[PDB]
Structure formats: C-alpha cells, structure tokens
Amino acid sequence: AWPKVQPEVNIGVVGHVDHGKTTLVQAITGIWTSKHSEETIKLGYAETNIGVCESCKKPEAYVTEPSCKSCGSDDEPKFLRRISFIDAPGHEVLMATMLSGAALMDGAILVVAANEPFPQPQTREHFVALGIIGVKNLIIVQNKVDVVSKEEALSQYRQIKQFTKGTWAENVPIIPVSALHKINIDSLIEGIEEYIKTPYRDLSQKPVMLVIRSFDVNKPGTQFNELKGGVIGGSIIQGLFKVDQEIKVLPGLRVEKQGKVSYEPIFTKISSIRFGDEEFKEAKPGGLVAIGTYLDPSLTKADNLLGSIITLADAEVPVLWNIRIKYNLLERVVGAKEMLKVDPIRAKETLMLSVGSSTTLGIVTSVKKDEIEVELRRPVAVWSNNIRTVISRQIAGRWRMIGWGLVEI
Ligand SMILES: Nc1nc2c(ncn2[C@@H]2O[C@H](COP(=O)(O)OP(=O)(O)NP(=O)(O)O)[C@@H](O)[C@H]2O)c(=O)[nH]1
Ligand SMILES: Nc1nc2c(ncn2[C@@H]2O[C@H](COP(=O)(O)OP(=O)(O)O)[C@@H](O)[C@H]2O)c(=O)[nH]1
C-alpha cells in the first residue's frame, strides 16, 4: 500500500489564459481545479501521489496511482512523493495572488499552446514574473501538440529554445503533451521528478506559515455549544507545526484606540491540521494546509486573516512599519501592446510590496542605487532577512511589477 502523507512540494502551473493550465492539472491529478470541493482554499489546487513501476520502462513507468498494470505487473509501484499543483485560473493581471502563490511554489510549469505563436504577450509576462519571484525550477510544457504537425511543433520548440537562450532558462526542458486528450502525460511526470526536486527542508527552523485563507467553517444552524474555532489555511514555508502548539498571528489583530491604529498579535492554539480531507498531527512545507484554531470565528471569517503569517507563540518575529529593501529593477516592463521602460524609484512615490503572502502599500522615504526605504500603510512580519519582496508600481491604472528585492534587518 501507499502511505497517506501530505504533499511535499508545490508546483505552480501558469501560462497565457486558455492555453490549458486547468486541463493539464486535471490530466495529471484527476481533479478539476475551477472549481473544486470541499474544502475551500481557493485558487486552483490539486494533489496527486507520484509513483514508479520498477520493472517497467520510463517514462511509461511513472504513475499517479498504485497500479503497474499498464506496464504488465500486478506489482505495486514504488511510492515517490505526493505533490500539489497551484494554478491561478481565469482573469489575469489581477494577481496580488500570483505573489501569494509565488511564495508557495517550489517550482513551476509554464504552459505554452502549440497552435498559437510564441511568445504571446501574457506568455512573456509570465516568464518575467517567474524570474522576479525567483522560482527557477521550471518546466515548459508545449500543450495542444495534437492540433499541429510534428513539424509545426518543432518549429515552436526552436522559437522557445531560442527565446530562453542566454537567459536563466536556457536549459529549461520543453515537454510536448496533450492535456485534453492525455498524450505524453508520462514524459511530463518524468520531467517533474527530474526537474523539480523536493527542496532541502530544515525542520529545526522556526515554524512559519503564510496565511492565504481564513474561514468560519460553522454551517448555519450550528448549535452554539457545537461551534468550531476559526480555521486558517495557507502553506508552511519552513519548520513544522504540530497539533496543540501555541501560535500567534502576525501582524495580528488591528486596533483603533480610537484614532491611532496599531496591531496586536493574535494568540491561539492549533486544534487540528488537514491536508485535503486527510487529518494529520503535523504540518510541514508543501501543499496547502488547513489549521483549526481556538479562535473566535469572526476573527477568521471571510479571509479576514489573509496575508498574515503564523509562528509559534514565543517566536521572535519583528513586525515593522518601515523597511529597508536591497532591490533590483527591470529595465523594461511588458506594459501596453509595446515594451515599456521603468522609471527609477522616486522619493515619496507610493509602491506595492509583496512580502510573503502580504500585499501591502508604502511611501518611499529614501532611495539609493541598491537600497530603498518605505513607510508602510500596514506593518509586515519579517521572519528572517533573506525575505524576498516584489516591488510593483501603478502603471496605467493597474499595478505592475517593476522589480524585486530583499528586505533587510
Ligand atoms: N483543521 C481543520 N480544517 C478544517 C476544519 N473544518 C474545515 N476545515 C478545512 O477548511 C476547508 C473547508 O471549509 P468549509 O467547510 O467549506 O467551510 P466554509 O463552507 O467555507 N464556511 P462557510 O459555510 O461559513 O462559508 C478545507 O480546507 C478543510 O480541510 C476543521 O475543523 N479543522
Ligand atoms: N485540443 C486541445 N485542447 C485543449 C488542450 N488543453 C486545453 N484545451 C482546451 O482549451 C480550452 C481552455 O483550456 P483550459 O484548460 O481551460 O486552459 P486555461 O484557461 O489556461 O485554464 C478548453 O476548451 C480546453 O478543452 C489540448 O491539449 N488540446
């Protein structure tokens, strides 16, 4: 038998909308992401086990369920790992969610339609977005190869391989498939194993989890004495959490008093840990977890806590209202139909910073070549110095990434 274990890695599936992201995840997992249930946790999210048939031949040997029959064995295949997929379906340019999901990803798949000319505009943007959020274990999937000749396909392979020449993606593998008719889906599973390894985990590190959702899971009609603590859900970036640990939510609760706004950490205990509809006793990185608490539900209702981080109660985690960022910029942003150039940061101009799952707004109080300082509209929990942030500006009525950087403390 295969063990029931949580997902150990997140892989984001992204690409120009309509190019087949949602279908591809379904080909692999057997689940359809928009929408799914339930659950809640939004986005697209789907998990699958991944296994190998030792007797049989690769790629065909790879399997997402515990049977080797397809290669001729009644033998049980070797369990490799459980993985999860996160894809943001539908409307794009809407992503402060690409930034949330950004910090969840241990690697990505960029879906490229084969019956359409490459790069499309949203396809170039996603390729830069990926560099900015610094997720570099990347497989490029050439989808819909079934609608075009081996030849039209190799042509696009040429174009893609060329377009990544000189880039950090120069050696990123390109895998042809049909998500809709399920062709060569095994080559892809092989590639995922080869090109997106579960990262080193250090379990001694201080537990930290980004909150991407919060619910009140009590159904209407629920008797008061049967009520359930608020549920927070999100993904653990480091350390591990255990049922019954004491934890706190940062920045936490927000106070008026009555004209001067501050933030108080929110303290509570972990009542339960769920991955999918599986309960567990611990939560490590990878996958999206649902943490039950002893919190008054009105605290977690309707994603109130979105953007928070969760640490253990006695953890030491600065909450700052001003931050120093060592930053790089892009020379040009894809912009309108034409390439656009980014002005250097100017004093007092307001910016959008994504830290972890937080998207928070700030006014730039100092600017130099490699560093800037911003006054934040809302404080951010900085759980370490390595923390990557994504600077974005207001360009044409819509917020758009102009570069990235490291928060310094
Ligand atoms: N650990 C834990 N997770 C829970 C619990 N109840 C629900 N979850 C998790 O929360 C999600 C399910 O939310 P759901 O039951 O749909 O609540 P809801 O319908 O959104 N709330 P509402 O009806 O108020 O809109 C899943 O991720 C599930 O695993 C619980 O008691 N403990
Ligand atoms: N022929 C063909 N059609 C596909 C393939 N993948 C997706 N589609 C179709 O493309 C349309 C939108 O694809 P979808 O999975 O929703 O991509 P998304 O919008 O990026 O999430 C749907 O009608 C799918 O049936 C494929 O591999 N081959």
UniProtKB/Swiss-Prot annotation:
Residues 178-180 are annotated as: G5. The keyword Transport does not apply. GTP binds at D18, H19, G20, K21, T22, T23, N143, K144, V145, D146, S178, A179, L180. Its EC number is 3.6.5.3. Residues 15-22 are annotated as: G1. PROSITE patterns: G_TR_2. It comes from the Archaea. eIF-2 functions in the early steps of protein synthesis by forming a ternary complex with GTP and initiator tRNA. HAMAP family: eIF_2_gamma. Heterotrimer composed of an alpha, a beta and a gamma chain. Belongs to the TRAFAC class translation factor GTPase superfamily. Classic translation factor GTPase family. EIF2G subfamily. This is Translation initiation factor 2 subunit gamma. It comes from Saccharolobus solfataricus (strain ATCC 35092 / DSM 1617 / JCM 11322 / P2) (Sulfolobus solfataricus).
